[PDB]
Amino acid sequence: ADEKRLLKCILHDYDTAIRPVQNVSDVVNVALEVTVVKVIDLDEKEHVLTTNGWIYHEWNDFQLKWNPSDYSGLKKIRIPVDRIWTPDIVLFNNADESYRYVVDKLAVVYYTGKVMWVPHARLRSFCVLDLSRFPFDSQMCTLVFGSWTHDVSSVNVTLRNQSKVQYMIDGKEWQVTSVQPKRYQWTYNSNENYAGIITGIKLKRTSIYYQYVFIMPTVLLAFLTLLMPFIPPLGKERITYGIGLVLGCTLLLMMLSDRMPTELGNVPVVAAYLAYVFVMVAINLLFAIMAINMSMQQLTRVIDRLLFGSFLVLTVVITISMYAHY
Amino acid sequence: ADEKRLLKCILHDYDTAIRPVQNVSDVVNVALEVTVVKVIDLDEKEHVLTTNGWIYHEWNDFQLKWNPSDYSGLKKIRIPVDRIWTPDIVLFNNADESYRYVVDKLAVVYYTGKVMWVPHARLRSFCVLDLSRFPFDSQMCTLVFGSWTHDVSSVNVTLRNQSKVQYMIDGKEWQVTSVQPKRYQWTYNSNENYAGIITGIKLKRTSIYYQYVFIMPTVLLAFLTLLMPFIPPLGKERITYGIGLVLGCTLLLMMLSDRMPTELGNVPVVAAYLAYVFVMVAINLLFAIMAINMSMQQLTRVIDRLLFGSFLVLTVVITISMYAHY
Amino acid sequence: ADEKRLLKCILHDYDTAIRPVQNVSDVVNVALEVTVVKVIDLDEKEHVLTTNGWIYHEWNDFQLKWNPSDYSGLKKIRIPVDRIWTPDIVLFNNADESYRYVVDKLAVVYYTGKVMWVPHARLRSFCVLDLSRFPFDSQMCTLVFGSWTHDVSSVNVTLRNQSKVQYMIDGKEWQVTSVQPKRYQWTYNSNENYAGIITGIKLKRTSIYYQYVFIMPTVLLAFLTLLMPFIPPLGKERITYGIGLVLGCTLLLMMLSDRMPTELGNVPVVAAYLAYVFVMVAINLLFAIMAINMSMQQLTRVIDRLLFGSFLVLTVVITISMYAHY
Amino acid sequence: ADEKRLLKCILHDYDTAIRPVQNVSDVVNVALEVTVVKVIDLDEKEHVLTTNGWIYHEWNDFQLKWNPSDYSGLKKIRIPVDRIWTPDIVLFNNADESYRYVVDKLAVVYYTGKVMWVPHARLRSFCVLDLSRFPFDSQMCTLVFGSWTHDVSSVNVTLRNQSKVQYMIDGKEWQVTSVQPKRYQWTYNSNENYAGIITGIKLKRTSIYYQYVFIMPTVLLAFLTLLMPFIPPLGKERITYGIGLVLGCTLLLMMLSDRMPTELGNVPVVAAYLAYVFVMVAINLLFAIMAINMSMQQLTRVIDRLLFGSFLVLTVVITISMYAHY
Amino acid sequence: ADEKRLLKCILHDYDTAIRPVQNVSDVVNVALEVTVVKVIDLDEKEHVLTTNGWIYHEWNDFQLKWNPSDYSGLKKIRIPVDRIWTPDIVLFNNADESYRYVVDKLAVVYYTGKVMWVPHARLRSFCVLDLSRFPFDSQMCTLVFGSWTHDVSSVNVTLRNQSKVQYMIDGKEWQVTSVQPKRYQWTYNSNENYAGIITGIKLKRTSIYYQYVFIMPTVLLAFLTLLMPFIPPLGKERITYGIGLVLGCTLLLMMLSDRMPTELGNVPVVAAYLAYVFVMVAINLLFAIMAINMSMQQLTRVIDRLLFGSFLVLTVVITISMYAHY
Ligand SMILES: *[C@@H]1O[C@H](CO)[C@@H](O)[C@H](O)[C@H]1NC(C)=O
Ligand SMILES: *[C@@H]1O[C@H](CO)[C@@H](O)[C@H](O)[C@H]1NC(C)=O
Ligand SMILES: *[C@@H]1O[C@H](CO)[C@@H](O)[C@H](O)[C@H]1NC(C)=O
Ligand SMILES: *[C@@H]1O[C@H](CO)[C@@H](O)[C@H](O)[C@H]1NC(C)=O
Ligand SMILES: *[C@@H]1O[C@H](CO)[C@@H](O)[C@H](O)[C@H]1NC(C)=O
């Protein structure tokens, strides 16, 4: 067949390690575009972002050149990348042992020498996230692609400006929206430059899981702690009520500590609210113990009334602040 | 032997990367049928479906052509796929790093050129599931198979209409039933088309695990919360009973939050019932605290009677609604 | 040396994909015997059985044939399986991504053409288990070995009847005993037959872990629930005692739900006993609340006496039934 | 260079599968010595021992023979094992899917034909452990190395008696000391013998983790249970104290069951002590309930005094026995 | 092209296993420098340090030698390491099964024969850590690189003194600072020396996670235990308050035991503080039980006053000591 003829012709002496430049003072312009098809997860416990997508490679191999008229058309031809040269472009913030692709067995080569690859992949990428508004947090995770072997004088990583589009994924957790990728240049020993593309995706947590697990038991334990100072001290049920709030808030803290990551810069607002509720139970237990201590003078109810007034107004302020965060 | 003769004959110049078309404007029709032998698990915590089954490949390789009379019969012959051409057909929603097969070492080739492969595999597939009726939920998970390298003008993925059958698996968890697969066409840059088969399987959770773990302690804690307002307030056991319900419902919430996934769109009905029970304990604690607060006028029992009446009728309505869900 | 001479002689034109039959209407009889050396674990949470053992292959390769007198003896010779033909026999219920062996680098070939392989392996096998008597359960897990590529007309999987022996392993968990393997024939599209061996091993759980963790706290919480109705109602300690049983039985339920698998057909007897204890605490709390409700007529002790009598006799019946299960 | 000359000379016709014997009735003596550099962990939950060390291979390859005077010295030469013959010696109790080495890329070959390998490795080995003295337990785990392909008539596994040394590792968990390795011979079908070395290492748990987590809360809950019968029954705080001990001992039991393995032969002494404390709380709750039951004759304090006396003397006996275990 | 000419010239007879020395009594000086770009995690539960960085190899291959004037410049050339010799330098304390690189597909070779490699990698390294000041602990973890095959007489591992720089990473967990690497020489059978570089990095935990999870509930439970002896004994709420502290401190202990590793040498200060709080609750429960025991002479308040005085002054001493640790 004619498809075997050009394949045996233009791969008769091809070496997969030779950089395809006609002159020694020349580079190859490798065009990249990462496109996410599905954001799988954002594991903040280990600061990884698991995602699925395809990275569009496009370079210009001048050694694979022919005219279609000698082969009766056939502009497109498909070669595995194990027999042609490929640029070593990997993630700059890879979060696993080795970088592997889902499909990497074919690459489209045109008659003008330009080569497309498009290997689909599952990318685990490190991305910095600040949990100062957990779980009502808007995020931004970056994927950095580039060459760690070839410098700028060997290859040139270029974004494609012909498709300056933006896309969105309406996940049930994250309302993922994309940011226009840019090129940022990393140096090496202040002489050699190692270029690379950077692509941000702006995650936005729209969750009903973390609200139901963390927001509503914390505000209801706050409600019970506010209901506590109407209990009269001379029956001996206020102290066991307070220690029940202590145990329930300890269980809620253990929930939160199981879910909140170690890799933490600032305290989340749900954690600060839970700490406020926990120390509020402590202060109310102090007031109950003092009240029953001098109950053995009996004009205690105005102290509990002003304590409920202060805790009511400050709890309304704190809850309104957390609602303004949401 | 004669089996070596045709193998050395029709693989004397075979290239595994050449697409087997006689004309350049021709495609190869690859027939697919996925068949599940056992659905292993549906991990909704990570939205994956682990299953075991074999995917039936069938294409037409015109380069492997011979007559049996020159080889004294032997219509069937078995070649490993590492020496012949195979289509790059993978899952469109694969949920692991790389796509691998359990057995992929043989493929049946006939004298008419048609090639069967049948590689058995363990497929981890992403599938969307809405847990609005957990755990009495009927589901539907899809397996999408197709080529991410060859377009429609190179290969053509075709369902086989000769076997339009349906099957079922009677698992102890899922009553798995199958749906007639169809073909859905995915586009690429609005010019190149990338076809593929889609196969739905309709899962149905028939579980006694999640009922015993979640349904019966929630309804029994509801029963205890309904029994609560018959306790007289002037003994100081109602408040510790209410905080015991608070701690028990917190433990049940921690059970549920351990089992309910983060990847959540809507709240499950067991979660809504547990939240209703938890806020019912909150309202009953408010009423008990108010009652013992003005116990220091003594006609409290009619308020507790009407409170039990309202909680009884609304609890019967909610439990009847959850039973109508089941 | 003479060992290289026959190796270069009878592998001078050997193809590893040719099925070794002299006539086209002939099969090769591959003799199998799986032998377990150690049953590692039975993970019922994922329905897998991890085991270690060697599978004894034995077939008849007529292409490796020589007389010892031309090579001065040397009946035994050892060839890696990468250079000779091997049958593609795998597990029919494999529970991992790919089937791999611990040692697969040598195979013994005799002068009569018969070939032994014996690759040792760690097998993860799916096996159906019914937990209707957890944890006093006698089990049976099956290992099915066969070819998914070669049919009956290509290879023939045969058990060896020369060694019809039975063995046993005295593990600290499982008293593992073996069952005589048999041959069961699986069909494919009702025309092609795909044979295979099946080997059952009869596990028997003899555990002191699950007894100490689950049986004794459940029966002691039953003992405390039986001790509950001797508490007089007019002191207000019966209700907090009952809610303490509620919280303790909730903790025990959370233990059991952590250990009991999701993949569940029937409720275990320890789970049914725990549910019975939990609803017994519910009924006793109902009776205590009613008693203290009409304590505000004072002839309550006969009701508690008959309640203890009914709960005593039915608890003795249930505990005797669970002991008869053991 | 001269280093390439002998490498091309004595590997000009080398086959990596030929067993290096001049006569057919001859074996090769492969000398083994495993040396542990660091014991990583002893996971008793899965009965594995993770360790790091190098296994010293030494055999006599008569096919790699030369005199140094023809190559101007160069007695030592270094060949990768992929081009020379190596004996297939693996662990007899391997605890992973496949046996792999950390470094296996070089092997030292001398001019006398003797070959050293020394591949460093991370070994996961099954070893039997009896937890009858957890966590004050002295242990012994074995590493068995041998050939599962070559029998005694092919290779001969030999310990080296020139280095009959013993070593020790002072870990913060295990005071690891080594035992002089010996040779134990395993049979196969009572005709073929499969030899192998066995090496015991005597672990000794010197832990402050398991003491602080398990020993001190159990003995302090024992202390609280002993303090319980001084509470007078006519205040209704003894029953809630006893149910608080029930809940605390249930939490401690859940700690222990999370840490104690399923793979259990005998109950640990900490588990027996916790069960004794738990049933002691049960007996004390029975005595408190009986006392408050006939409190409605008032000479109860001598019964509580003799009960404290019996529980004191038997608790001192049990604690002295557990201290004598330590 | 000219780039293929020298590649075919100086690799026309290259063997990848020959050590590149002109004389037999010569070594190759391999220059190493590990550089960390990001410290991923320090898992003290398994004593591993996961990090990302590149290790700078530099050796002198005299077999790859040419002048640029015969090839019109081109001093730099890039060869994959699979076709040239590379030194077998691995981690001496590797914490996984096999040592693999993220990128290892290229290596820069100059016209003077010196070869750079720079493979980026994710290193899991064992490092000793003493948790005597958890979580306010300054740490030091070491990475040891060297050859386990080539001795000092074959290769020579050398640090590069031209870059004696120090760097720092401002993580949200660890304020990572680097230490000047040195060379330490390991012996083998007291005759052969096996050199290697060692590089320390000085970690410093600056966390708000472990403080909020462990420090504040322990000090607040200490605060509640200090508030306990103002409760009058003749109401029967002191004992249930003490058992509530017992249950809350048990939950906090279970938090800590879940987070504190088994691999423990000394008790952490948070663990010692929690044990002190737990035994303080025990002593206060003893004093409350004694007080209510002889309440049935009534001058008890001075004993509780001196007990609060002693517990106040010793708690201030302990908390001031833990603050001086911080
Ligand atoms: C790489 O391509 C960009 C595209 O604009 C260009 O600006 C830059 O100079 C190029 N780098 C080179 C030629 O080294
Ligand atoms: C692929 O096969 C289907 C089968 O009906 C056909 O409808 C479709 O046109 C084919 N696609 C081509 C030929 O591009
Ligand atoms: C396979 O071997 C068994 C052994 O008895 C025999 O019964 C069966 O007929 C054989 N199958 C064939 C020859 O297809
Ligand atoms: C293997 O070596 C040991 C070393 O003493 C020897 O006793 C034994 O007989 C040898 N086995 C043979 C030669 O089969
Ligand atoms: C290795 O290099 C160091 C660098 O100073 C040198 O001191 C040492 O002697 C060398 N080792 C040899 C030549 O064996």
PDB file of C-alpha atoms in Angstrom, chain D residues 2-4 7 40 52 54 74 78 80 83 101-103 106 118 120 122 172-173 208-210 212-213 216-217 220-221 223-224 227 230-232 235 237 240-241 244-245 247-248 251 254-255 259, chain E residues 15 17-18 24 47 90 94 96-97 126 129 148-151 154 188 236 239-240 243 246-247 250 253-254 256-258 260-265 267 271 274-275 278-279 282 285-286 289 292-293:
ATOM      1  CA  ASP D   2      41.158  -3.455  27.789  1.00  0.00           C
ATOM      2  CA  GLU D   3      37.944  -3.537  29.854  1.00  0.00           C
ATOM      3  CA  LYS D   4      35.853  -4.009  26.704  1.00  0.00           C
ATOM      4  CA  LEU D   7      33.766  -8.413  28.220  1.00  0.00           C
ATOM      5  CA  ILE D  40      11.220  -0.646  59.211  1.00  0.00           C
ATOM      6  CA  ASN D  52      15.612  -3.021  54.560  1.00  0.00           C
ATOM      7  CA  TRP D  54      21.046  -6.608  51.387  1.00  0.00           C
ATOM      8  CA  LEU D  74      41.842  -6.214  36.249  1.00  0.00           C
ATOM      9  CA  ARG D  78      31.398  -5.503  36.936  1.00  0.00           C
ATOM     10  CA  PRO D  80      24.883  -6.311  34.915  1.00  0.00           C
ATOM     11  CA  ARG D  83      23.640 -10.536  30.616  1.00  0.00           C
ATOM     12  CA  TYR D 101      15.242  -5.123  44.297  1.00  0.00           C
ATOM     13  CA  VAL D 102      16.309  -1.571  45.084  1.00  0.00           C
ATOM     14  CA  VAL D 103      19.606  -1.932  43.197  1.00  0.00           C
ATOM     15  CA  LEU D 106      25.686  -4.559  38.851  1.00  0.00           C
ATOM     16  CA  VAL D 118      24.646  -8.067  46.707  1.00  0.00           C
ATOM     17  CA  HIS D 120      19.846  -4.267  48.289  1.00  0.00           C
ATOM     18  CA  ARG D 122      13.090  -3.835  50.915  1.00  0.00           C
ATOM     19  CA  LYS D 172      13.000   3.217  69.492  1.00  0.00           C
ATOM     20  CA  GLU D 173      10.289   0.561  69.081  1.00  0.00           C
ATOM     21  CA  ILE D 208       6.103   4.097  75.352  1.00  0.00           C
ATOM     22  CA  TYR D 209       3.287   4.590  72.825  1.00  0.00           C
ATOM     23  CA  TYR D 210       1.190   1.513  73.638  1.00  0.00           C
ATOM     24  CA  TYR D 212       0.493   5.556  77.371  1.00  0.00           C
ATOM     25  CA  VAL D 213      -2.419   4.759  75.048  1.00  0.00           C
ATOM     26  CA  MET D 216      -2.573   3.843  81.886  1.00  0.00           C
ATOM     27  CA  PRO D 217      -6.255   4.537  80.925  1.00  0.00           C
ATOM     28  CA  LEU D 220      -7.015   4.442  85.860  1.00  0.00           C
ATOM     29  CA  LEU D 221     -10.514   3.269  84.888  1.00  0.00           C
ATOM     30  CA  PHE D 223      -8.909   2.887  89.876  1.00  0.00           C
ATOM     31  CA  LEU D 224     -12.199   4.746  89.319  1.00  0.00           C
ATOM     32  CA  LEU D 227     -13.386   4.177  93.988  1.00  0.00           C
ATOM     33  CA  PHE D 230     -17.727   4.484  98.511  1.00  0.00           C
ATOM     34  CA  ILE D 231     -20.527   6.476  96.856  1.00  0.00           C
ATOM     35  CA  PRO D 232     -23.665   6.325  99.041  1.00  0.00           C
ATOM     36  CA  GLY D 235     -28.274  10.289  96.186  1.00  0.00           C
ATOM     37  CA  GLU D 237     -25.211   9.505  91.367  1.00  0.00           C
ATOM     38  CA  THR D 240     -24.730   7.540  86.270  1.00  0.00           C
ATOM     39  CA  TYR D 241     -21.145   7.098  87.499  1.00  0.00           C
ATOM     40  CA  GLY D 244     -20.004   6.713  82.663  1.00  0.00           C
ATOM     41  CA  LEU D 245     -17.465   3.973  83.378  1.00  0.00           C
ATOM     42  CA  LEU D 247     -19.101   4.466  78.189  1.00  0.00           C
ATOM     43  CA  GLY D 248     -15.444   5.222  78.953  1.00  0.00           C
ATOM     44  CA  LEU D 251     -14.363   3.997  74.170  1.00  0.00           C
ATOM     45  CA  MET D 254     -12.896   0.771  70.671  1.00  0.00           C
ATOM     46  CA  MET D 255      -9.341   2.171  70.855  1.00  0.00           C
ATOM     47  CA  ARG D 259      -5.287  -1.242  67.283  1.00  0.00           C
TER      48      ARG D 259
ATOM     49  CA  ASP E  15      29.027  -0.144  25.870  1.00  0.00           C
ATOM     50  CA  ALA E  17      28.378  -1.112  31.327  1.00  0.00           C
ATOM     51  CA  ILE E  18      32.058  -0.201  30.847  1.00  0.00           C
ATOM     52  CA  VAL E  24      42.646   0.516  35.320  1.00  0.00           C
ATOM     53  CA  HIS E  47       8.937   8.116  59.530  1.00  0.00           C
ATOM     54  CA  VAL E  90      20.686   5.889  44.855  1.00  0.00           C
ATOM     55  CA  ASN E  94      15.099   4.976  50.461  1.00  0.00           C
ATOM     56  CA  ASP E  96       9.839   2.770  48.783  1.00  0.00           C
ATOM     57  CA  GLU E  97      10.171  -0.374  46.683  1.00  0.00           C
ATOM     58  CA  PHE E 126      13.752   7.840  56.037  1.00  0.00           C
ATOM     59  CA  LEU E 129      12.778  12.472  64.317  1.00  0.00           C
ATOM     60  CA  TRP E 148      25.909   0.649  46.575  1.00  0.00           C
ATOM     61  CA  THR E 149      27.673  -1.110  43.684  1.00  0.00           C
ATOM     62  CA  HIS E 150      30.783   0.902  42.841  1.00  0.00           C
ATOM     63  CA  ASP E 151      33.270   1.370  45.677  1.00  0.00           C
ATOM     64  CA  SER E 154      35.606   2.639  41.056  1.00  0.00           C
ATOM     65  CA  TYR E 188      31.853  -2.486  53.776  1.00  0.00           C
ATOM     66  CA  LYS E 236     -24.764  14.940  93.480  1.00  0.00           C
ATOM     67  CA  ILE E 239     -19.427  12.905  90.293  1.00  0.00           C
ATOM     68  CA  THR E 240     -21.216  13.145  86.941  1.00  0.00           C
ATOM     69  CA  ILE E 243     -17.054  11.328  84.772  1.00  0.00           C
ATOM     70  CA  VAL E 246     -13.197  11.396  82.140  1.00  0.00           C
ATOM     71  CA  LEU E 247     -15.157  10.802  78.927  1.00  0.00           C
ATOM     72  CA  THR E 250     -10.795   9.879  76.812  1.00  0.00           C
ATOM     73  CA  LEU E 253      -6.775  10.884  74.180  1.00  0.00           C
ATOM     74  CA  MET E 254      -8.313   8.999  71.272  1.00  0.00           C
ATOM     75  CA  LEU E 256      -4.123  12.200  70.160  1.00  0.00           C
ATOM     76  CA  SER E 257      -3.527   8.446  69.816  1.00  0.00           C
ATOM     77  CA  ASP E 258      -4.976   8.609  66.297  1.00  0.00           C
ATOM     78  CA  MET E 260       0.534  10.413  67.551  1.00  0.00           C
ATOM     79  CA  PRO E 261       2.663   7.737  65.826  1.00  0.00           C
ATOM     80  CA  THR E 262       3.404   4.261  67.110  1.00  0.00           C
ATOM     81  CA  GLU E 263       7.061   4.785  66.128  1.00  0.00           C
ATOM     82  CA  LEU E 264       7.696   6.703  69.344  1.00  0.00           C
ATOM     83  CA  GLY E 265      10.779   7.162  71.508  1.00  0.00           C
ATOM     84  CA  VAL E 267       6.261  11.014  75.065  1.00  0.00           C
ATOM     85  CA  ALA E 271       0.637  13.770  75.611  1.00  0.00           C
ATOM     86  CA  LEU E 274      -3.101  15.238  78.626  1.00  0.00           C
ATOM     87  CA  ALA E 275      -1.978  12.437  80.966  1.00  0.00           C
ATOM     88  CA  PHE E 278      -6.431  12.820  83.077  1.00  0.00           C
ATOM     89  CA  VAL E 279      -4.799  11.839  86.382  1.00  0.00           C
ATOM     90  CA  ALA E 282      -8.759  10.966  88.752  1.00  0.00           C
ATOM     91  CA  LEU E 285     -12.801  12.300  91.608  1.00  0.00           C
ATOM     92  CA  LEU E 286     -11.075  10.573  94.548  1.00  0.00           C
ATOM     93  CA  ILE E 289     -15.915  10.621  96.493  1.00  0.00           C
ATOM     94  CA  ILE E 292     -19.327  12.862  99.873  1.00  0.00           C
ATOM     95  CA  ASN E 293     -18.434   9.647 101.738  1.00  0.00           C
TER      96      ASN E 293
END
